[PDB]
């Protein structure tokens, strides 16, 4: 069985950081429209708080992709990227594989700025370059839950992000 | 060219119905597990803020679908077979894709099947459908905000408004 | 993965689609028909099947699977609504994949709604489904060609043989 | 709509089939292949051409939709159905009924580029080289159709036509 070890970042700590986050992408794209593109399914928690705090005129959309061995893209996006400014958002980057492909795929629609923005960052774990612009915390726990983020399909509920164990 | 009229539901008004409809869920599901299922896009603010009120264990998938019947875009992936399901949208109008949602997951054979909309505009109904759980009813007119569009636009609002 | 014996010649598969073409062309004498192909393995006896039906005839895909319940992958886009609707399939095992299918089509409420499937193992029945339009009936367990892969290989084999 | 006449008469369409086959065994003599199928109309024309293809043959099919208007001047197009298949290190046949002015598959061509194949070739039944916008010559042609309406073959006007065994002019 699966249980909850320790909280590894409160919900007021993912609070501020959301805060944090978004009024750095304000700054970054000042006075610019932007698109957020949230990688289902984890991030969406991520995403619903971090759009509340920016108030660029902002297009939100969803991607879909599933990996295996390069990536299936299983759900394209509907909006128009193209010369637009696109934030991705992630719940966690660790291989970064998926969203290598995904990063390649939103270049074909030509959109003027594509910026990765991930809650979670492991970038000892990369298989591939890939460096997101915007990134929460570096956090070192194995088996990471909470706020949108699964183990087995549990646990997207809380509103804090705890470590698993077995 | 769309502007924002008025703000009909603030963000405090929204978090207080979030939670008294989360406190209904789980009460209604006690000692049990369940499955929400989000309709793809504009209910997945309601349903980030609602599931975290939720203490029950969990478990979350979205569906899409358009009207042309109702044509699925992307039917779910998770098990509802012998499960307890709540289905959450963000407004209910003709009722016509819930309704067509309700057949297409009652042939999956959940335990129960419910309906949670945050909003409600009764007026329009094109086909019987009465959600168990309905945040607010409302005027029928245009509104945006807090995952709700306006030709893409407004979703990021923290509060629910009426444009012009 | 090797062929051994050829099952079902070109020709036999031939001569059997241009009887079933003529059958589906009398019962729907005058009318237009709808016929959706269940993806993948179904192509090839469709894109035939339809070549020897003098009706006007539109065609659709749909795709679908189990979850181990059947997952709607693909839905279809043309309207069926009020129209004769043949879902064309490979092979009619368990029929539960196309019983779900069945339903989730009747939804759309079809004029008619019929099944023709190349190969038909009514012994694998799982549900009750009874395919009006049915090619062959063999025994064989495992067999490839004209669409039917094994692990995705021997697809374009014009004839239907047995593997090893 | 009314069916003028004939263009490529059922015959005809089995012989340059033959060729086309013919043509992707030389060329990928001694290989395996992956045939992708660009759905809706090529179905027809891909399941006839595979059952003269002798190699190992893999098919996998691939769904796009347009963007509107866009999807007019850049062949910018939505992915709706994306292969199963794994192409990668593999010789990749994509397969379509027509190409216009080619927008749409040279997009088409570079999603397929990102899974990194060992080959990519496109085989199509009808050519508008006269109509391209974009560079993109299809190594495997079967014919050259002279702009008009055409029907037949897989190939649908307003969902209507596909079951037709020839190809047909339109009114």
Redesign the interface.
């Known amino acids: 069985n699966i249980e909850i070890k320790d909280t590894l970042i409160s919900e007021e700590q993912l609070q501020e950081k959301v805060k944090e986050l978004a009024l750095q992408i304000e700054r970054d794209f000042e006075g610019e429209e932007i698109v957020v593109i ?1 990688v ?2 984890g991030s ?2 991520f ?3 971090l ?2 705090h ?2 660029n ?6 991607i ?1 992709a599933s990996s ?3 990536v ?9 990227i ?1 010369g637009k400014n696109v934030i991705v958002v992630e719940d966690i980057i660790d291989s970064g594989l998926t969203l290598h ?1 995904l990063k ?2 939103f270049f ?3 959109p003027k700025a594509l910026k990765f923005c991930t809650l979670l960052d492991k970038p000892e774990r990369r298989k591939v370059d890939l460096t997101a612009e915007y990134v929460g915390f570096q956090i070192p726990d194995e088996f990471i839950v909470g706020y ?1 983020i699964d183990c087995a ?2 646990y ?4 804090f992000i705890a470590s698993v164990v077995t």
């Open positions: 949230a289902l399914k969406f928690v995403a619903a708080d759009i509340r920016i108030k005129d902002v297009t939100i959309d969803f879909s295996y061995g390069k299936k893209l299983l759900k394209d996006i509907d909006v128009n193209t492909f390649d795929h074909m629609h030509k949108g399909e549990k997207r509920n809380l509103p």
